[PDB]
Nucleic acid binder design. Structure first.
Lengths: 67, 68
DNA sequence: CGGAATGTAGGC
DNA sequence: GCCTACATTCCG
């Protein structure tokens, strides 16, 4: 389920992956993919790769949408 | 981190206070308790739910570990 | 997936 | 406006 994320620049994808077991069973992890295919696991990490090129202040990392 | 015995609780219960290093609440602290087996507790009701009627926590000050 | 580290809603 | 209590992130 690597789906296009319309809130980021073209080529950027989003994946949500369900945790299958343990204490956090049924919660999920959200990942982003740049055009090259770099995997990003957090909003600060994403903000660092992009820097001043994209304003992520309103960006909701979990849903992939601007608030 | 230092785990301090909490004399006010039953034998073996310990307390730790951790300073937040960054973010909005930087400089504030969080207090945690540990059972003698080492399970971590983060609030007074969590601690009350675990101990049940073995201890009365009505007067227990979570922050300081002191009965008031 | 865990869990230290931090965010944050709602009671006060 | 601040704190309690618990929700959630973020990196290992």
């Amino acid at each position: 389920k690597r789906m296009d994320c319309p809130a980021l620049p073209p080529g950027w994808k989003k994946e949500e992956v369900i945790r299958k077991s343990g204490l956090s069973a049924g919660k999920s992890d959200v990942y982003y993919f740049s055009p090259s295919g770099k995997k990003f696991r957090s909003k600060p990490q994403l903000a660092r790769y992009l820097g001043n090129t994209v304003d992520l202040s309103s960006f909701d990392f979990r849903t992939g949408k601007m608030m």
